[PDB]
Design a protein around this ligand. Structure first.
Ligand code: NAI
Ligand code: NAI
Lengths: 415, 415
């Protein structure tokens, strides 16, 4: 009620909103629908440009398909191999006044671009750890594809509800055995903070292994196998990171590392199951450190990546998710001579572990301070890549314009 | 529900919003709380700078006090004469997701700045045409001031509900007798549109006089008088515009002009009432054309003002609301020698009616086209002034930042 009330249409501004980056730590509480779409198209375009990949799979299940490496797999499979993709993820739909998660908009754009190139895209939104979601996934494969010939396992979560026990496990990102003096990056104030991270309880290590270890991967392959929806000679891989000695106290030999080691264990039993089924295979694929929602949350990583970006950009070996996963498909998943390591893992992370990069990064680490951040490190590149995750800082996108956050997805099974 | 749901605070972004100009025609559906505040402070600052005005009123009622000329009076009275001001207006409070009107935020900032300088500020929000609002206004004067010594009548509305009949009159902005070929400015496409405005029915002229004529002004003075809340020797003025021959077909000799003429009629009876009461007075004050919500809605005005701004800026006589009203107080309402005209109206609009300005404007009018708008006219200045009304384009204001639209007002009587 004012003096000109009702003599004037409210218009669409009432249902739409201006969406801008809102960052606290490694958390961004907003996502831009138009920019996620454009970010995804950027990745699709990269794969299209590099060109088709021969000897690729044709019916692919990606578990964790909405963001980061899982999305990059979905795009590589789809636009590089022409594969049909069934994506499983866990994301918040957008609604009025309330932007959905990144993953939601990424997947909406994925379905859109897939349809444009005549590719199959269906997705399932819900807890991948649950039996219910597994069943829904099997039914979808049954009805539409008959079988899948590749299963990409790409989950990153801070928790898991055991499909059998009631128990809710929580992921812990601590060091093991001994406390660590962390010299990190405060991303908001843009200074060097200095922490001390206490090592994890056994109880926490067990929880981290339960979340990010290989049990669920195993449960998935088994469920798929005995529903008969896995093709003979099928291939499944789960992503992991090794890093080098600088990251080791926190990651590889930390609690998250304990989980990733459980991975190398479970992959044996799973490989056995796929070997028996028409000469199939199961590998752990090691990828380089990139900026994603998962890696951001890892202590030391923001500064590590800031440095890593600087060195590798100079060296010319800098890549993100989509380049990593494309080359993982081309060189190792589909290629003649695969990059196998001593443990029998595929490898795409070697350019990062180049001893020249690691030494150059290491000597820059102890010597970074509040005055030289923008000269010793590519903190700028990092920030930009972080914002990119959420659809921000994209070129061609008008962030001052109204956008409707209520973006729906065709052929989206909601569980 | 996503994978990291609840492990993360939503934060204030949930209740706040980014507010940007949203303009369709002479309508802007948003207003910026921080910018309205800053716009008001700009005006206050101007008055403070020019310096105190001697011989001013001390207890002032401003009817139509939230925007445009009425606000400018409220600020001049308050910050130039140190007067206590009781403001009457009709505005929409802000709430979450829904910016209030300009006037609302203007008044919130007014109460704020007034309190800072120890001045009295109370306002009443509701229909000034109604008896109820008049009563509420009288009670407020009774309780806090005893009496007012100045009544500024500054209403601009497209309608009026007669306080006695049920009848709802609607204001019409048409020419009289004969149709008009209007050469105007399309403000969105930024081209020259060309219309044909049919003259108004008698029925519409009567409605326009009922809305913007002097009946309500009269009803106000009377109501005040016989409640005994008007001081002896009180002064009341109502604002009007005359313009020159270019504006005459649409304004002065149009339907709105019929109303403004009813003003000159009613002011006689009202002056008689104030003369009898201790030597008081009632005048019609004529002000120059400025950019406001009221004038924007008037055909031909956008282009007229665009031109007028250009010429007067060059001449150095360009002013807006606050300069007009300050000088109206200084020179004519409070000053020794008042600018009285043949009809006995006060005048602040003379710099506009300078025959040199009007001729220069006129020869530019027929000769403006889609290619020369940004060189023949100050369409830029116009747009900026228009945006300023709603708190936009203000310097020092971060329009990318979240702002809470729920801004409340102390000592605000809501009717
Ligand atoms: N980010 C890096 O630097 C590297 C990442 N990785 C690994 O790649 C994998 C993926 O990590 P990112 O792509 O970085 O993380 P991410 O946060 O971008 O993606 C996680 C994906 O899993 C989904 N997800 C999480 N919980 C789920 C649930 N309960 N049910 C269904 N979907 C769920 C998300 O929706 C999303 O699609 C992980 O194994 C991670 O350790 C390995 C090498 C380095
Ligand atoms: N804008 C111009 O170029 C000129 C304006 N004027 C006159 O000055 C007066 C004010 O006009 P502006 O300041 O331009 O318009 P405006 O739209 O800025 O202000 C109108 C004011 O009256 C209030 N109002 C409208 N209806 C109301 C109602 N039913 N109850 C209570 N309050 C109500 C609004 O809240 C606002 O405070 C009018 O008489 C107008 O004709 C005269 C000379 C030129």
């Amino acid at each position: 009620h004012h003096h000109s009330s009702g003599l004037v249409p409210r218009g669409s501004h009432m249902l739409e909103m201006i969406i801008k980056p809102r960052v606290r730590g490694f958390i961004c509480v907003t996502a831009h629908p138009t920019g996620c779409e454009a970010n995804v198209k950027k990745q699709i375009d990269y794969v299209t440009t590099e060109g088709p990949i021969a000897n690729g799979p044709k019916r692919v299940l990606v578990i964790g398909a909405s963001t980061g490496y899982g999305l990059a797999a979905r795009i590589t499979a789809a636009f590089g191999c022409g594969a049909d993709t069934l994506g499983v993820f866990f994301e918040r739909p957008g609604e009025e006044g309330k932007p959905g998660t990144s993953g939601w908009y990424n997947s909406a754009a994925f379905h859109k671009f897939a349809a444009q190139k005549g590719l199959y895209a269906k997705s399932i939104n819900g807890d991948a750890f649950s039996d219910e979601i597994k069943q829904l996934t099997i039914d979808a494969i049954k009805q539409d594809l008959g079988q899948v010939d590749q299963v990409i396992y790409s989950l990153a979560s801070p928790r898991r509800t055991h499909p059998k026990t009631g128990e809710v496990f929580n992921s812990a990102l601590k060091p093991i055995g001994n406390a660590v003096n962390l010299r990190g990056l405060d991303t908001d104030k843009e200074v060097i903070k200095e922490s001390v991270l206490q090592p994890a309880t056994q109880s926490e290590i067990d929880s981290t292994v339960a979340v990010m270890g290989g049990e669920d991967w195993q449960m998935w392959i088994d469920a798929l196998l005995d529903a008969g929806v896995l093709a003979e000679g099928a291939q499944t891989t789960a992503f992991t990171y090794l890093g080098e000695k600088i990251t080791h106290d926190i990651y590889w030999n930390g609690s998250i590392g304990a989980a990733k080691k459980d991975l190398d264990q479970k992959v044996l039993a799973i490989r056995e199951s796929l070997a028996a089924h028409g000469g199939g295979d199961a590998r752990v694929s090691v990828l380089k450190a990139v900026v994603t929602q998962a890696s951001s949350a890892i202590p030391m990583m923001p500064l590590y990546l800031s440095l890593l970006f600087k060195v590798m950009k100079e060296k010319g070996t800098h890549e993100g998710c989509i380049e990593q996963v494309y080359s993982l498909y081309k060189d190792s998943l589909c290629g003649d001579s695969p990059h196998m390591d001593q443990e029998g893992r595929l490898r795409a992370d070697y350019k990062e572990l180049d001893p020249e990069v690691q030494n150059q990064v290491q000597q820059l680490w102890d010597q970074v301070t509040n005055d030289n951040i923008y000269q010793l490190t590519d903190f700028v590149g990092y920030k930009s890549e972080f914002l990119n995750l959420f659809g921000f800082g994209i070129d061609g996108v008008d962030y001052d314009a109204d956008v409707n956050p209520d973006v729906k997805i065709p052929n989206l099974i909601q569980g």
